Structure 1
Amino acid sequence: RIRIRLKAFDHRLIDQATAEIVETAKRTGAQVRGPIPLPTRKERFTVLISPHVNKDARDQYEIRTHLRLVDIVEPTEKTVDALMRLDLAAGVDVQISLG
């Protein structure tokens, strides 16, 4: 089988990017295994704000890396080819992985 990761920062931009892959596999063939919601790393950061001397005043930011994963079971030639035909919008990373 062939598995693809999807990493993004925004879950109104990961879901179109994964529906345009399920509606590519299910338009070149069949046997996709849906999106499976993996864990979500939240890389926090905490900085001071004041330029000289205030240790009791802070801003706290986070970054929430959204994961998804999609399997592909029985690949034809056009099934693997119409996927590498496809690019995606910026913000989303992929990494194709046979097994």
Structure 2
Amino acid sequence: ITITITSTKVKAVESLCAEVKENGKKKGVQVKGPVRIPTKTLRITTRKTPCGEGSKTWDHYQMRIYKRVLSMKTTPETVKEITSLKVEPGVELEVAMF
């Protein structure tokens, strides 16, 4: 199995990154290490004014995407059963079967 987690909050995925790893001790024997794929900042630059007047000013918005990848052998039927765990809003969990 391969667990891929991505979210805008670093501590949201990081807390859940160790939640699956700790959970792997039961109904299983091992979970591979967390791979920290480089982040992807989403920079959008806009003019502050709603018109052409004023000085030339800009604001630099940005959003970061944090990617973590986990590996684990187990069984497809009982990998995590529910595999929901009431994940926090803003986080996404995708499981790559086989």
Asked whether the two chains share a fold, i.e. TM above 0.5, the reply is: yes
Number of aligned residue pairs: give it.
Answer: 97
1:36-83 per-residue CA deviation (whole Å, 9 max, x = no partner) reads: 0012111110011112224610001111011001001233754x1446
- 84-93 or 2-11, larger mean C-alpha shift: 84-93
Amino acid at match of 1:97: A
Q: Secondary structure at the match of 1:84?
A: coil
Residue 91 of structure 1 corresponds to: 90
Structure 1 residues 15, 81: CA separation in 2 closer, same or farther (over 3 Å shift)? closer
Q: Comparing both structures, which one devotes a greater share of its residues to helix?
A: 1
Structure 1 residues 43, 31: CA separation in 2 closer, same or farther (over 3 Å shift)? same
Gap regions ≥5 residues in structure 2: none
Whole-angstrom CA distance in 1 between matches of 2:39 and 2:14: 15
User: Percent of aligned positions with the same letter in both sequences?
Assistant: 26
Gap regions ≥5 residues in structure 1: none
Q: Comparing both structures, which one devotes a greater share of its residues to strand?
A: 1
Residue 60 (1) aligns with residue 60 (2): yes
Residue 15 of structure 1 corresponds to: 14
How many Å apart are 1:15 and its aligned residue?
1.2
Whole-angstrom CA distance in 2 between matches of 1:83 and 1:3: 16
CA contact (8 A) 2:10 2:66 kept: yes
Alpha carbon RMSD of aligned pairs, Å? Answer: 1.9
